[PDB]
Amino acid sequence: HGGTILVVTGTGTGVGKTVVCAALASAARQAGIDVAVCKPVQTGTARGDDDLAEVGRLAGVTQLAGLARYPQPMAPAAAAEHAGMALPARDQIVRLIADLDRPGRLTLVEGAGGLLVELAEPGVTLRDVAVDVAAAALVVVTADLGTLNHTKLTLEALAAQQVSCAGLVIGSWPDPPGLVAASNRSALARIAMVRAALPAGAASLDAGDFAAMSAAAFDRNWVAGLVG
Amino acid sequence: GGTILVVTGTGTGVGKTVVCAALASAARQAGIDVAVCKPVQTGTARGDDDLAEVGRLAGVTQLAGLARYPQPMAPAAAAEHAGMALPARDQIVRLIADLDRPGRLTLVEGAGGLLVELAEPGVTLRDVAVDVAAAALVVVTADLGTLNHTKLTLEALAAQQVSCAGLVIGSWPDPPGLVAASNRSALARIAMVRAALPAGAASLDAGDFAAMSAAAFDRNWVAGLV
Ligand SMILES: O=P(O)(O)OP(=O)(O)OP(=O)(O)OC[C@H]1O[C@@H](n2cnc3c(O)ncnc32)[C@H](O)[C@@H]1O
Ligand SMILES: O=P(O)(O)OP(=O)(O)OP(=O)(O)OC[C@H]1O[C@@H](n2cnc3c(O)ncnc32)[C@H](O)[C@@H]1O
Ligand SMILES: [Mg+2]
Ligand SMILES: [Mg+2]
């Protein structure tokens, strides 16, 4: 059974993971692909952080699946302990994802921060979860300096667990670029394939312009190729 | 040979140089002899000079480098902007092994994070630490995102059997905050935290710096390094 499961991870916190989910969901929806988006661990609710609500905003996705939510804008382990709550178990995240899986569906799973952040006790990360559900990983990266060492460390940690890499996406592309933010994209595109570079402030594009942005941002052929 | 530590970090601008200077300053006050190698320096046009920072703050005189690049980019893009090549793998490794003598603490600073291209073709500080059989001291932040970056760097080290000498928080803020103090406890759960240097230590003069560094590390560990 199953369709296509992609963890959408990142070189760090705040790199565009959520806008990239919403852009790839949008492009896949416009290709006729059914799309589910899953955020198993959500911190920062007491300041209004809601990555599922944002994905439904920008892309209209309705199949939005959550699990654990914590008020403080901290790492999940710290946020949960600050609230007196536990992290979810590994099999609770896996079940949440497996229930969404469906032939012909693209299910996108957003972690918390970067690849090795602890999501379930003890020390269970998005990479473990990717292993359990046989998912490949989209890696959201910046163009700022530091992006190369963080990307390489991230690709290395995936391959050490045989989690396949589906490419990279630049979460915020400034118009026009600069010498580092050009040599980086050139250096990034030498490390792996840049599936998209979402214009800066895509997160503020209204429903209309986001749909158009997303369709151009991604190679319509690559998208449709992710799911039979 | 003596003791060789590569002093790496989770990223750019995390305080690797001030930590070199701080550990060199503690080691000297423990009667240890210290050398620092910085094979590739970039950003010389705006006047970046990591080895001179160590000279001033800690009084090291054995300060070795191989290449200087004007543009403030990573080594590879700095070398390519200038139309000239990075040094070669053999030069860097041999410079350090020649620096290494018995009784000496020799610290090596790359550029940015562990896996940035340091020599040609695409050789990293990790490859250099393999060749010279160095351990790695890992300079980190206490900000959001440090646990992921730290775990990513520590796994990369261990994949090539380069031993982790410990963590050092390069800048400890005043006052900590909820995130920074939470991160400090969690970092300590994944490796030894040898020091957390106060924010602004790199601006101190040599006497203040030597006093801060003497208090920042544990005497026994420093004394045991060599
Ligand atoms: O938003 P954070 O806390 O970084 O959590 P995250 O790890 O899930 O973040 P992403 O990789 O998905 O990157 C995109 C999000 O960064 C958020 N963000 C961006 N700029 C911000 C700012 O100045 N202040 C607070 N949050 C911001 C913004 O809400 C994006 O949806
Ligand atoms: O100094 P950079 O360019 O970051 O390259 P690096 O790889 O050698 O960086 P380090 O980890 O060695 O140490 C952090 C540096 O950030 C420096 N820095 C300190 N205050 C700064 C400020 O206001 N603005 C920009 N950089 C600053 C600081 O002096 C350190 O040299
Ligand atoms: Mg997000
Ligand atoms: Mg430095």
Give me B98's structure tokens: 């020649």
Annotated active-site residue A39? The verdict is yes
- φ, ψ of residue A74 to 5 degrees: the values are -130, 175
Determine whether the shortest distance from the Cβ of A76 to ligand 1 is under 6 A: no
Question: What contacts B86, CB < 8 A, 6 or more positions away?
Answer: B40, B67, B75, B76, B79, B117, B118, B119, B120
Counting ligand 2 atoms within 8 A of each CB, the residue from B16, B117, B197 with the most, and so the one to mutate, is B16
Subunit contact A149:B112, Cβ cutoff 8 A: yes
Q: Kindly report the length of chain A.
A: 228
Going from N- to C-terminal start, the domains of chain B cover: 1-226
Q: How remote is the C-alpha of A87 from its chain's centroid? A: 20
Q: How remote is the C-alpha of B135 from its chain's centroid? A: 11
CATH code for residues B1-226: 3.40.50.300
Question: What contacts B31, CB < 8 A, 6 or more positions away?
Answer: none
Smallest-distance ligand from the CA of B140 = 2
Gap between the Cα atoms of B21 and B10, Å rounded? 18
- φ, ψ of residue A169 to 5 degrees: the values are -140, 130
Which residue has the least CA distance to atom 13 on ligand 2?
Answer: B15
Subunit contact A72:B114, Cβ cutoff 8 A: no
Subunit contact B147:A12, Cβ cutoff 8 A: no
**What are the C-alpha distances in Å from B82 to residues A124, A188, B115?**
45, 21, 22
Which residues make beta-bridge pairs with B4?
Answer: B106
Gap between the Cα atoms of A6 and A101, Å rounded? 11
What technique determined this structure? X-ray
For residue B20, which atom of ligand 2 is closest to its CA? 12
State the binding site of A.
13-19, 39-43, 51, 110, 146-149, 171, 199-203
Resolution in Å, one decimal place: 2.3
CB atoms within 10 A of CB A174: 14
Residues with CB under 5 A from ligand 4 (ion): B 16-17, 50
Residues of chain A with a CB closer than 8 angstroms to some CB in chain B: 12-14, 72, 74-75, 77-78, 82, 113-118, 145-146, 148-150, 152-154, 156-157, 160, 179-180, 183, 187
Strands A124-125, A118-120: pairing kind: antiparallel
Which residue has the least CA distance to atom 4 on ligand 2?
Answer: B13
CATH code for residues A1-228: 3.40.50.300
Subunit contact A116:B178, Cβ cutoff 8 A: no
